[PDB]
Design a protein around this ligand. Structure first.
Ligand SMILES: NC(=O)c1ccc[n+]([C@@H]2O[C@H](COP(=O)([O-])OP(=O)(O)OC[C@H]3O[C@@H](n4cnc5c(N)ncnc54)[C@H](OP(=O)(O)O)[C@@H]3O)[C@@H](O)[C@H]2O)c1
Ligand SMILES: Cc1noc(C)c1COc1ccccc1C(=O)Nc1cccc(Cl)c1
Length: 314
């Protein structure tokens, strides 16, 4: 169950989200990634930011080793963090992510954010006054370093994440371009459905990948507790009763039926197993336009600290 990418390789349309807050013990990312693979996931979304590539790579390496799966069956994804946007820091970051996860290549390497941060070992550098230190980098130079990684064979496909239309065209309107981004991974869910951005990506053979499709983890550091909880929407709860399903399954099927590759994080065995069942039912045209009307342009990620960056995507 995949969608062909604009460089030839294939991406499973349902992916597993591996991020959990640092409060969650690192051993969990190993247990739930194996359970996700046993449940039927073959697309695994990770990143250098999530501090989990060893447990994730170990789980992948262990399911390959016990004979459940082979390396070609697994679509593994990592992301270049924003402190590594200077072109010389790109390949060492990917090799470090490969060394950490113990894989010879990633199926997908993404530019995690367009908001470049100052290079360093800190995932978020902060100055004297406790504010985040930005950095100015021409992102097309970063993409060239990304392109070389695909040539080197460390990344089967390369793409971006949290890129708006203007930032996407900057990559497409790049001189000497060799590989267009196979995908743009952005926040997408019935309350914020990226309809105009999805049309643009469709018009460029670029796959839109939805993160926070279930309505996000609502971490206290980045989300307002008064913001609407997507899985409590009366419309989503109503359709789940009609189809005898769950509100999460309604949200996941919503993206799968408009050409969106959808991610879903879960560290709960039953909900992990519950999410693969999105392929067992279908939404009607009436159900699709009912969810269509829920768009209220709601960013679950909100950060005024990152509102002053020249490349902030929204
Ligand atoms: N490119 C980027 O900038 C970016 C940003 C954010 C996230 N991501 C990636 O996208 C992945 C998913 O996004 P997300 O972190 O916002 O989480 P999410 O997919 O929106 O899920 C939100 C919450 O819903 C719960 N859940 C999972 N399955 C459920 C089900 N069947 N029914 C009810 N609840 C369910 C989960 O809690 P339980 O664990 O308890 O089940 C989960 O924490 C992340 O893991 C990350 O890899 C990428
Ligand atoms: C927009 C956008 N542009 O880049 C990113 C990444 C995003 C979305 O970010 C999130 C979405 C969902 C949940 C969490 C996050 C997040 O934790 N962002 C973050 C941003 C900057 C620094 C650091 Cl440390 C974290």
């Amino acid at each position: 169950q995949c969608v062909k990418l604009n460089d030839g390789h294939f991406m499973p349309v349902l992916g597993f989200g591996t991020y959990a807050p640092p409060e969650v013990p690192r051993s969990k990312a190993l247990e739930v990634t194996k359970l996700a693979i046993e449940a039927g996931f073959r697309h695994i979304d990770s990143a250098h930011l999530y501090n989990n590539e060893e447990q994730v790579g170990l789980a992948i390496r262990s399911k390959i080793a016990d004979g459940s799966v082979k390396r070609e069956d697994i679509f593994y994804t990592s992301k270049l963090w924003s402190t590594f946007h200077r072109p010389e820091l790109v390949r060492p970051a990917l090799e470090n992510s490969l060394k950490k996860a113990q894989l010879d290549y990633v199926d997908l390497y993404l530019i995690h954010s367009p908001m470049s941060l100052k290079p360093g070992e800190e995932l978020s550098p902060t100055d004297e006054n406790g504010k985040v230190i930005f950095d100015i980098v021409d992102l097309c130079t970063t993409w060239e370093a990304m392109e070389k990684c695909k040539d080197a064979g460390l990344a089967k496909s390369i793409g971006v994440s949290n890129f708006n239309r203007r930032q996407l065209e900057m990559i497409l309107n790049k001189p000497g371009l060799k590989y267009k981004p196979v995908c743009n991974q952005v926040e997408c869910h019935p309350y914020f459905n990226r309809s105009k951005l999805l049309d643009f990506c469709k018009s460029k053979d670029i796959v839109l990948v939805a993160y926070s499709a279930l309505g996000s983890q609502r971490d206290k550091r980045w989300v307002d507790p008064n913001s609407p909880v997507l899985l409590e929407d009366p419309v989503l709860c109503a359709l789940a009763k009609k189809h005898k399903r769950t509100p999460a399954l309604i949200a996941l099927r919503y993206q799968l039926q408009r050409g969106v590759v959808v991610l879903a994080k879960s560290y709960n065995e039953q909900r992990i197993r519950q999410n693969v069942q999105v392929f067992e039912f279908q939404l009607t045209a009436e159900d699709m336009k009912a969810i269509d009307g829920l768009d209220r342009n709601l960013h679950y990620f909100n950060s005024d600290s990152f509102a002053s960056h020249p490349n902030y995507p929204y």
